[PDB]
Amino acid sequence: MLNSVTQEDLKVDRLPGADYPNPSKKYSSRTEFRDKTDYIMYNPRPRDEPSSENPVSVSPLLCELAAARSRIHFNPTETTIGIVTCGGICPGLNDVIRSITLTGINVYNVKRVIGFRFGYWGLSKKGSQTAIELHRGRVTNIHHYGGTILGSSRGPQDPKEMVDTLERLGVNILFTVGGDGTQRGALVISQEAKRRGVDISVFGVPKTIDNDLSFSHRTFGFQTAVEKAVQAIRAAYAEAVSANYGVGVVKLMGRDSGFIAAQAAVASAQANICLVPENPISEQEVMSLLERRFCHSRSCVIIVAEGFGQDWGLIDIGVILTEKVKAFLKANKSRYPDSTVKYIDPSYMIRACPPSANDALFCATLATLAVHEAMAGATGCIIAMRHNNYILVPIKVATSVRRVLDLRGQLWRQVREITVDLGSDVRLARKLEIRRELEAINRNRDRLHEELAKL
Amino acid sequence: LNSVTQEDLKVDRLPGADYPNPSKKYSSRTEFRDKTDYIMYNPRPRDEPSSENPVSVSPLLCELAAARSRIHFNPTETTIGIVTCGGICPGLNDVIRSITLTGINVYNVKRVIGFRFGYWGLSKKGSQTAIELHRGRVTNIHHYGGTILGSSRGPQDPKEMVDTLERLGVNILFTVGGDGTQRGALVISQEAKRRGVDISVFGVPKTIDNDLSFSHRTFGFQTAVEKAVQAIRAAYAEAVSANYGVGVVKLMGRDSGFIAAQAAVASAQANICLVPENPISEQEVMSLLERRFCHSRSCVIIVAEGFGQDWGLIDIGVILTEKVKAFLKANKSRYPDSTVKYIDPSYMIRACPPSANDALFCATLATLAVHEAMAGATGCIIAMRHNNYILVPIKVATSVRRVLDLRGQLWRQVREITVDLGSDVRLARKLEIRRELEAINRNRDRLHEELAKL
Amino acid sequence: SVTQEDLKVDRLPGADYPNPSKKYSRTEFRDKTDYIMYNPRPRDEPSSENPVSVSPLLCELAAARSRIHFNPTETTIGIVTCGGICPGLNDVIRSITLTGINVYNVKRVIGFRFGYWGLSKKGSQTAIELHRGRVTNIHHYGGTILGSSRGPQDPKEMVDTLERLGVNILFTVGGDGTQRGALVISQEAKRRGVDISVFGVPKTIDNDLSFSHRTFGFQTAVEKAVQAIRAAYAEAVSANYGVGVVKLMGRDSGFIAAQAAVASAQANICLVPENPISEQEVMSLLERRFCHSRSCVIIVAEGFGQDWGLIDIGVILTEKVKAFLKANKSRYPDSTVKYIDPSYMIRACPPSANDALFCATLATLAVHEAMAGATGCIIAMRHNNYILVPIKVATSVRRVLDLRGQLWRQVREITVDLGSDVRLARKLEIRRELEAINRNRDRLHEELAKL
Amino acid sequence: NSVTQEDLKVDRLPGADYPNPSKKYSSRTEFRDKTDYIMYNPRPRDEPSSENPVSVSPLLCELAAARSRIHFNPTETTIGIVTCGGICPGLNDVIRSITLTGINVYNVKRVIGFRFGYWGLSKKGSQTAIELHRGRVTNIHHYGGTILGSSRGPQDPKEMVDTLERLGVNILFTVGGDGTQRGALVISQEAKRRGVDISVFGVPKTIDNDLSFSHRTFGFQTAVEKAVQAIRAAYAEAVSANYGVGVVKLMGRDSGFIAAQAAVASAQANICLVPENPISEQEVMSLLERRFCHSRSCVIIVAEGFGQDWGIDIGVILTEKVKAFLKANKSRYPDSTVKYIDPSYMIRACPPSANDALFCATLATLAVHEAMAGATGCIIAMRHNNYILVPIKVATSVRRVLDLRGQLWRQVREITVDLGSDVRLARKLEIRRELEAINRNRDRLHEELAKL
Ligand SMILES: Nc1ncnc2c1ncn2[C@@H]1O[C@H](COP(=O)(O)O)[C@@H](O)[C@H]1O
Ligand SMILES: Nc1ncnc2c1ncn2[C@@H]1O[C@H](COP(=O)(O)O)[C@@H](O)[C@H]1O
Ligand SMILES: Nc1ncnc2c1ncn2[C@@H]1O[C@H](COP(=O)(O)O)[C@@H](O)[C@H]1O
Ligand SMILES: Nc1ncnc2c1ncn2[C@@H]1O[C@H](COP(=O)(O)O)[C@@H](O)[C@H]1O
């Protein structure tokens, strides 16, 4: 499916012609704009052992790098930019709206920037009345608060009606901020526009807090969601450690992927069990890990992605896991007397907020390069990040496959180093830990008796 | 330089891997590594896209860090030492905690020792103060700033220090510190080899400035940016609250501008960003200020501590503030009742617990450092490039300092948000008035309509 | 019904020792009991003579005393934390310990583990020695280093433990249940003629203590509640006809819901147990908000609407708002409802700076007054001063929002009313906005003429 | 205080001809028919008797509340707002709550924001004045500074009342310090002289919490929150060094309220230096050397107003002198380190704490209630947990300062180092307490280990 992917699948569509010079006065000289397309390897691992001659990629694939171009497709002073935000909100939405608007105006001096309201609905004939004019002063402070100043909706709309609106308002570039659904719909707008011979770029900024985009290592807002998940885990840990046989359960977003659950688990440094849809395990296996933790520890923290254990009945795995942990501890009152289970569901608090500084940097940079490349005629593509570089990826290939935790990858390996195992001798482990602690006590006893001898 | 060879990147291994990895953390024993895996130093292709697979611009391959099938040290007889040197940095306690817990929870090591107050803690007098790091001692240390071991800047006698490592039975010393510390670490490694003593010395790079070669990110850097942004928000609030207000923020960056540059973009409020890599004159700075003040009533200036050392080691924050005040006083006629507010957050950007993303990074660096030291790696540091954890010999890592690429992606992003001298500011304001009048008129129309149906 | 005798704070017999504190001259310790008025409102108009209280009642002020009941170098302090955790618990443990050691140089400080269970014969084995180095950093994280439990224990068994370990002062950190049990320990100790102060630090995040304006951790719970409301508002304002529902703690009182509502500055409806209103009245307020606004934020205390069918009012209110909006798709098309329950996140955290100050001060004065023989009482705050209140009166009556008080009045100024003409209001607001647009249009056409 | 009940009598514009239009309260009984009072000092003069207690002070302060009858006709009323002096956390919250109370409660005709302090009411400056409608203030509470802007300067009172007349302003809210409120009283009096119907009503802005007839000013608690952030950093630097010293300078030109509360709130302070308690260079170094007897780190908090006799930036000077002292004593304190943090404007140029947002909204809301009800020449303040009105004249006569015999300063001294206590005896007893812990732990561990 992913080994099915060819260099042609990664070839980024360009509208015909680059007839205008880049007006940007932001770089030192004109040599810092790009004459030609530069690439980066999809997989920078070598195929063979080190030789005398240079290394060769395991993969045939090259990803197009995003940068400001010498020659652009759209005449800046006649260009109108449209922005639309679709689906659930995500930290940094306002940062993206702000940076598209300011890059369009401060760098390219575009005629006009339009904000379509409440998702694709804003491009319907009735909805287009609500469209707002984004001037520089309108976006100055929007990055301080959560949500989208434009609003969102999950619905699709009639592509014919939507391209009617883009024509009527003279929109030459539409930036679609949304998930796979939105970008699939964006590609349909691009194709309807081409069919009518209308000069319109449609350019996607991927919005998925779950970080489940293929050809991508990081989507905007994900790191912020982890920051907030850690806040919920700290609370769960405080509840759990404050009880004799205390259990803290945190449910986090992750419908089909466990990236938030896994990173939050490691980042918290307090997680004992981490449950993700990629690693389905039974009720009985979970309770085994709990009873193992309780052998020589009096508290347990369980992180569960909302997508985990859908076969345990779209159902609330947080409530169900909490019931089953309570049921298990009640069945074993003799071993775990006066046990307590505390459940935390931070739900929307991890996505409905302003971004972390690192996410603000990322949002601004994604938005800025998106405008550079759309001005330079890029269409039917998304901007993404891989191996620390900003790349362009056609929507078709990006929306064909969902990314998921590699259970043999680096992150999941780190999760297993901090969580409880069934393999290791827990009695032997406690025996050695008592020795390490007695050695500390005895060195302290000695250093103290010494200090006390000199008063 | 471009005179770096594959041999410069070859990571030293102590002789023998006689023990199986005891780790019970992974699903099966196939998830440990039989052989050394590599990643390209430069994953850009040399030629245009062909029929055959792409080829690196660079000959160089960096060794990837991972848990190994076979390890050099007998876990239940192994003693780990930790020492923290130099200025503190967000995540120091996270690193101490993760070395300790990886050593104990994964490898079941005999003992973990924390040497106090840097290399001084391995001197004969200083070794009395060494503390026993058991699991219960490190449980909560990640909640607060600084180092539970303490630091010092000083070097010590390598002979005296290897005496201490022998006497206390230390098999692995983790050196958390800057180039100075890692150069000294390599000398400990070599003194140990000279005496035929079985000791790995393994570096965790500590530099908040993110100025490590063969590296894209050092621990604590992202946290320093988070705190720099806090100082810029304050500077902006002061500046925008005044008619012709100027906010000046000085940030760390002795020889590099990574913190200044990322904080500038991350704040989204910066107008001028001054870094040692791009020396410009007093007159050029005041030009950018006067340009900002053409059609704006506030200006925010970020300055790295290393910028403008030629302006007559010296506090560029205080000097830049004096000169901006002097310039605005000389021009009261154009800029009446101007205000200049100076913020130096200094140690507040490094003396704190890490961001979540830095906690993840610290724990992962520390964990892989223990895997690789157990597996016999010595005279090297762990680092991050292109989103992967790699090993790099200390010799090459300490030969050259990393610095902003003025033609790189970050510095390009800084210039998109900051003031330029090239663009017509009168034309720009003319067009912005048009865009704003169009907004006002569409709103005026939607309102006259809503009002007709009330 | 409360009399001056109900407020008389019990003192153990004798003050035979000088206060050893070298922190302050000796004139800054107190010779005699000082008081503050329960109600500092005047009975009569302003006169020639000084004003006179509406209330006969005087509350005893807390301060370090010249003469103390316990011999410091022979005194052992016990600490126990009971019930659900609360922001600043570790700050209180830390300040009791450091005041005991740094100020009074007490022999020993013992931390009983997991609530009153820690003073049972089996539980007392787990008791920990609180020396100065053990508490240095505990204020950086949430929960209690001692642990908690809800259970009571045999008072006879517990006073056995206090005798065996030589505990002279037990600090009981907990709610009314805990302090009622604390008073029983105090009385069992007196019955056996054993020299033991039992002194309460009130733990209730709900701020529902009588003879009190503020309990520790409450302001921190509000800080975290506001975080949940900001998220609810971001969800709601990002939707056409969006509704954000936040459930907050408040089993019997609405202090958190009310303060969070005002502090957020984003609340449209605030539902508290003190003001029971019907499903139909709530939906009336929603439909009123939606007349000329596209978002609504609803704060609901967990104790509100228990007659709507112990039950999760957050889930039930959310279902009913969804049901109401679905029944009215014609007026509110593509409406969305987002529910946030921050639950334990508002109590399982380190305190705000203002709560750290409060916790340290409560704990420090608690140690001063227990050393000075105070027993069977709690320390509390009224009218910006630290006071002592006997447990008996403090545990007789629960405090609840005054619907005619200053806070609830402020909640109603920011929330939607049924009384006002919404059409007239929108008419005038369009005028105010058009005046802004027209002045801006003029200032811009001018600036542009001189470019 | 030579202060009399007459000094506290709050001026009312003549007439209350309009009913309160507020539909926010359940019924009309929740508005106030008459002025209610609270005692300046609620401490009793005599011991508990049969009869009710009597105040030590003759003074009664007027309580702030929404009134049954108001002076200004709401639908013809224009509110002006001006922000003067250095910014302070919650400025935008105050602008927002004045605007929303004016519009949502009273349905006032118009709200005007004068820009860059009193300058905005000058004839040239009034061109820049902005229209505050409901939509303009929705989100301003999320960020620091003032959307109106500030300046320190006074202006011609004649010119300013000219502007208020021309624009039809009936209420001017003056957000600023004593300087601003003194100038506000002059506007009030110039308006009265011309027989023009104008309330001038002050919202006190001082982060230092140095207002008389007041226990808390808006933004103070937020400044403490941020000061603690600087102290945590200082402590991390200091504890990470052998003989480490962290020095934090905080605002406090004439008062030490921020320094004192930050010291206690941080729980990490060893020395706290405030202008109210001037002590010598030699006395400071005595406290440092005492801390270093049995501790390896010291945190020193210094208010900017401390040690003006030291012969100016007290932060830089104290740091130099501590370095000089430790260098003179290398033998006792080898490889010592001193780290200086000046958070300066970071403690005031930010959005408020939740508790300060509550306070700002409440101050602003009651300010509008009372100005609509004809109050003028006064400020709103908080004492003993209640909102009160205080004439500007008395409020601007005297500065408030730490009581060195008061409750807060006593709490500072409980946590800081003393010279009086036997440090050898103290360490002896602390080693005993720690050995008792070690021995109980050694026992519990040998036991657990015997049963595996
Ligand atoms: N290598 C590691 N890095 C970071 N956190 C870890 C690591 N190993 C374990 N942890 C976490 O740290 C906690 C230590 O507390 P405890 O398990 O009670 O000793 C464990 O519960 C894990 O949640
Ligand atoms: N492309 C961009 N992305 C992010 N921040 C930017 C960008 N362009 C400008 N900014 C910042 O946004 C601010 C907007 O304020 P103003 O220029 O006063 O409208 C500028 O001063 C910059 O600091
Ligand atoms: N006097 C006030 N003080 C503080 N917040 C208020 C006040 N009046 C209203 N609010 C809040 O501020 C919001 C203003 O935004 P909007 O209602 O959309 O105009 C209201 O919905 C209330 O939550
Ligand atoms: N009663 C108290 N309440 C709060 N903080 C205190 C108290 N006594 C001392 N402190 C602070 O707690 C710190 C404890 O660290 P140490 O002095 O090393 O034990 C002291 O340095 C003071 O800053």
Numbering used by the authors:
A (entry chain A): 20 to 332, 346 to 487
B (entry chain B): 21 to 332, 346 to 487
C (entry chain C): 23 to 46, 48 to 332, 346 to 487
D (entry chain D): 22 to 332, 347 to 487
Paper text:
Sequence comparisons of Trypanosoma spp. and Leishmania spp. show that divergence of the two genera involved amino acid substitutions that occur in the enzyme’s ‘reaching arms’ and ‘embracing arms’ that determine tetramer stability.
We also show that Leishmania PFK melts at a significantly lower (> 15 °C) temperature than Trypanosoma PFKs and that addition of either AMP or ATP results in a marked stabilization of the protein. Sequence comparisons along with the enzymatic and structural data presented here also suggest there was a loss of AMP‐dependent regulation in Trypanosoma species rather than gain of this characteristic in Leishmania species and that AMP acts as a key regulator in Leishmania governing the balance between glycolysis and gluconeogenesis.
